[PDB]
């Protein structure tokens, strides 16, 4: 079948060749249909922004992991070779509730609404 190939229907379309005959042979008609036609994207001829600015950014920001932890029937944690967190800077455990199993949670900074349920089935807190 190497001589009768076919691409998946829907991929691939013949690119548009402007300016090659009279099934359209152009672009616009005057003004900035000049080559490298300007207007900055933004620069709409009077401010555009120029209207307030509010700023900072500082340091420490955690990395969330919600109580969708239908892991094993117990065991410790932070072990995320398991398919859960990755690219963590800390590890808070939040809610969206379903503490459907009992285990011992361990990460830094647990959310109060979460930990109320984690400790209401097996007890669990740490740093």
């Amino acid at each position: 079948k190497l001589h009768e190939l076919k691409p998946a229907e829907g991929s691939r379309k013949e690119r548009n060749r402007v300016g090659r005959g009279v099934a359209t042979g152009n672009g616009k008609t005057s003004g900035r249909g000049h080559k490298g036609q300007k207007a900055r994207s933004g620069g709409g001829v009077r401010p555009g922004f120029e209207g307030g600015q509010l700023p900072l950014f500082r340091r420490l920001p955690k990395r969330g992991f919600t109580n969708i932890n239908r892991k094993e029937y117990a065991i410790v944690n932070l072990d995320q070779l398991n398919k859960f967190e990755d690219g963590t800077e800390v590890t808070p455990a939040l809610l969206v509730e379903s503490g459907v199993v009992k285990n011992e949670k361990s990460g830094i900074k647990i959310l109060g609404n979460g930990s109320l349920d984690k400790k209401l089935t097996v007890k669990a807190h740490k740093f």
Partner: protein
């Protein structure tokens, strides 16, 4: 080359939402006592970049969130 971010807008945008740019609002600097206390208290609460302008400013904050 990577597109540069218009950092002057980014100092006044805040993205978040479901793609909408947040706010910042005008006449909020100085020269009070000519705006109404009604105008004053209301320009305090913030409003998004408009549909028509996000059509124009879409490229500059492409890297915000």
């Amino acid at each position: 080359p990577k597109m540069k971010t218009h950092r002057g807008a980014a100092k006044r945008v805040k993205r978040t939402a479901s793609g909408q740019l947040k706010r910042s609002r005008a006449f909020t600097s100085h020269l009070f006592a000519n705006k109404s206390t009604k105008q004053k208290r209301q320009l305090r609460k913030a409003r998004l970049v408009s549909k028509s302008d996000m059509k124009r400013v879409k490229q500059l904050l492409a890297y915000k969130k």
